[PDB]
Design an enzyme around this catalytic site. Structure first.
Site, PDB file in Angstrom:
ATOM      1  N   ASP A   1       0.839  -1.203   0.000  1.00  0.00           N
ATOM      2  CA  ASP A   1       0.000   0.000   0.000  1.00  0.00           C
ATOM      3  C   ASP A   1       0.870   1.247   0.000  1.00  0.00           C
ATOM      4  OD1 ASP A   1      -1.855   1.984   0.461  1.00  0.00           O
ATOM      5  OD2 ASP A   1      -2.780   0.982   2.192  1.00  0.00           O
ATOM      6  N   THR A   2       1.133   1.795  -1.184  1.00  0.00           N
ATOM      7  CA  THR A   2       2.021   2.951  -1.250  1.00  0.00           C
ATOM      8  C   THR A   2       1.395   4.204  -0.643  1.00  0.00           C
ATOM      9  OG1 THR A   2       1.287   3.365  -3.518  1.00  0.00           O
ATOM     10  CG2 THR A   2       3.310   2.091  -3.201  1.00  0.00           C
ATOM     11  N   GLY A   3       0.079   4.218  -0.443  1.00  0.00           N
ATOM     12  CA  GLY A   3      -0.599   5.312   0.224  1.00  0.00           C
ATOM     13  C   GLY A   3      -0.584   5.263   1.735  1.00  0.00           C
TER      14      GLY A   3
HETATM   15  C1  LIG Z   1      -4.634  15.424   6.047  1.00  0.00           C
HETATM   16  C2  LIG Z   1      -4.286  13.996   6.485  1.00  0.00           C
HETATM   17  O1  LIG Z   1      -5.473  13.414   6.998  1.00  0.00           O
HETATM   18  P1  LIG Z   1      -5.416  12.042   7.924  1.00  0.00           P
HETATM   19  O2  LIG Z   1      -4.118  11.923   8.582  1.00  0.00           O
HETATM   20  C3  LIG Z   1      -5.670  10.593   6.763  1.00  0.00           C
HETATM   21  O3  LIG Z   1      -4.917  10.863   5.593  1.00  0.00           O
HETATM   22  C4  LIG Z   1      -4.881   9.784   4.679  1.00  0.00           C
HETATM   23  C5  LIG Z   1      -6.155   8.969   4.425  1.00  0.00           C
HETATM   24  C6  LIG Z   1      -6.124   7.796   3.435  1.00  0.00           C
HETATM   25  C7  LIG Z   1      -4.816   7.470   2.711  1.00  0.00           C
HETATM   26  C8  LIG Z   1      -4.796   6.264   1.709  1.00  0.00           C
HETATM   27  C9  LIG Z   1      -4.951   5.014   2.560  1.00  0.00           C
HETATM   28  N1  LIG Z   1      -3.892   5.022   3.548  1.00  0.00           N
HETATM   29  C10 LIG Z   1      -4.076   4.761   4.976  1.00  0.00           C
HETATM   30  O4  LIG Z   1      -5.126   4.500   5.477  1.00  0.00           O
HETATM   31  O5  LIG Z   1      -2.854   4.844   5.689  1.00  0.00           O
HETATM   32  C11 LIG Z   1      -2.893   4.869   7.158  1.00  0.00           C
HETATM   33  C12 LIG Z   1      -1.965   4.010   7.610  1.00  0.00           C
HETATM   34  O6  LIG Z   1      -0.599   4.810   7.341  1.00  0.00           O
HETATM   35  C13 LIG Z   1      -0.856   6.092   7.626  1.00  0.00           C
HETATM   36  O7  LIG Z   1      -0.389   6.880   6.696  1.00  0.00           O
HETATM   37  C14 LIG Z   1      -1.597   7.453   5.863  1.00  0.00           C
HETATM   38  C15 LIG Z   1      -2.684   7.345   6.641  1.00  0.00           C
HETATM   39  C16 LIG Z   1      -2.417   6.250   7.610  1.00  0.00           C
HETATM   40  C17 LIG Z   1      -4.730   3.772   1.707  1.00  0.00           C
HETATM   41  O8  LIG Z   1      -3.633   3.926   0.905  1.00  0.00           O
HETATM   42  C18 LIG Z   1      -5.939   3.601   0.760  1.00  0.00           C
HETATM   43  N2  LIG Z   1      -7.118   3.251   1.601  1.00  0.00           N
HETATM   44  C19 LIG Z   1      -7.610   1.843   1.633  1.00  0.00           C
HETATM   45  C20 LIG Z   1      -6.727   0.961   2.573  1.00  0.00           C
HETATM   46  C21 LIG Z   1      -7.027   1.264   4.042  1.00  0.00           C
HETATM   47  C22 LIG Z   1      -5.746   1.078   4.876  1.00  0.00           C
HETATM   48  C23 LIG Z   1      -7.017  -0.543   2.241  1.00  0.00           C
HETATM   49  C24 LIG Z   1      -8.493  -0.940   2.487  1.00  0.00           C
HETATM   50  S1  LIG Z   1      -8.358   4.476   1.613  1.00  0.00           S
HETATM   51  O9  LIG Z   1      -7.840   5.845   1.487  1.00  0.00           O
HETATM   52  O10 LIG Z   1      -9.166   4.369   2.830  1.00  0.00           O
HETATM   53  C25 LIG Z   1      -9.299   4.062   0.118  1.00  0.00           C
HETATM   54  C26 LIG Z   1      -8.866   4.637  -1.190  1.00  0.00           C
HETATM   55  C27 LIG Z   1      -9.670   4.241  -2.412  1.00  0.00           C
HETATM   56  C28 LIG Z   1     -10.863   3.256  -2.243  1.00  0.00           C
HETATM   57  N3  LIG Z   1     -11.869   2.665  -3.288  1.00  0.00           N
HETATM   58  C29 LIG Z   1     -12.798   1.809  -2.612  1.00  0.00           C
HETATM   59  S2  LIG Z   1     -12.456   1.795  -1.098  1.00  0.00           S
HETATM   60  C30 LIG Z   1     -11.250   2.709  -0.956  1.00  0.00           C
HETATM   61  C31 LIG Z   1     -10.448   3.106   0.290  1.00  0.00           C
HETATM   62  C32 LIG Z   1      -3.538   8.281   2.964  1.00  0.00           C
HETATM   63  C33 LIG Z   1      -3.572   9.452   3.960  1.00  0.00           C
HETATM   64  O11 LIG Z   1      -6.612  12.163   9.061  1.00  0.00           O
HETATM   65  C34 LIG Z   1      -7.681  11.260   9.130  1.00  0.00           C
HETATM   66  C35 LIG Z   1      -8.993  11.948   8.736  1.00  0.00           C
END
Ligand SMILES: CCOP(=O)(COc1ccc(C[C@H](NC(=O)O[C@H]2CO[C@H]3OCC[C@H]32)[C@H](O)CN(CC(CC)CC)S(=O)(=O)c2ccc3ncsc3c2)cc1)OCC
Lengths: 99, 99
Positions: B25-27
């Site tokens: 998960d590069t995100g």
């Molecule tokens: C201003 C900053 O706001 P913020 O800190 C949150 O910011 C962020 C919010 C989301 C991301 C991207 C997200 N990364 C993430 O969850 O990473 C966690 C863990 O590592 C930390 O690093 C970054 C955050 C922390 C995943 O890459 C992608 N995701 C799914 C995965 C869930 C893990 C697999 C199911 S998805 O986005 O939910 C998504 C996308 C398309 C899609 N199409 C159908 S479903 C569906 C669901 C990056 C930063 O405050 C909170 C409000």
């Protein structure tokens, strides 16, 4: 090109005649972008991740350019804390993971 | 390997001596696994995703093998929707994005 992952893989995209910054996100099935008032019809949708679900508007057949590479597909628009380019579009630009 | 993105980039990992499946998960900045038993001390942490924040257990300096490649780093354990390998460990195994 090649993008290392020491920092967030942020790139410039062009969509709806606007330039934005978005993450190349292999963990995202779909592409989810910050609120923008795109023209045309849309369908309501909910997408989930860590913390739960958000409500988004689904727009189909949208043209996006990602680092000079053109793609066309579905974009979800809503109160996402981060713009993410998901696999539906990353495949279209020939993006792979390599190690 | 070179991994395309038409399907979810799921791989087998080994952690605590147990095999599991996880998403490259590069995100994700950090690595977050579903509820499990891991030996050693842990500290409570909060992490934020698309839907808000969750509480996790932070395990530091944990051995984890990802698709045959060894890493030693921080693993968060808690109510994530799926096991994700984030950039903290993707960098360790030499993973890049390429297009
Ligand atoms: C201003 C900053 O706001 P913020 O800190 C949150 O910011 C962020 C919010 C989301 C991301 C991207 C997200 N990364 C993430 O969850 O990473 C966690 C863990 O590592 C930390 O690093 C970054 C955050 C922390 C995943 O890459 C992608 N995701 C799914 C995965 C869930 C893990 C697999 C199911 S998805 O986005 O939910 C998504 C996308 C398309 C899609 N199409 C159908 S479903 C569906 C669901 C990056 C930063 O405050 C909170 C409000």
């Amino acid at each position: 090109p090649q993008i290392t992952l020491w920092k967030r893989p942020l790139v410039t995209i062009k969509i709806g005649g606007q330039l934005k910054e978005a993450l190349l996100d292999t963990g995202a099935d779909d592409t989810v972008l910050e609120e923008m008032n795109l023209p045309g019809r849309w369908k309501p949708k909910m997408i989930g991740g860590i913390g739960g679900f958000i409500k988004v508007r689904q727009y189909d057949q949208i043209l996006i350019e990602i680092c000079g590479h053109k793609a066309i597909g579905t974009v979800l628009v809503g109160p996402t804390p981060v713009n993410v380019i998901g696999r539906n579009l990353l495949t279209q630009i020939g993006c792979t993971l390599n190690f």
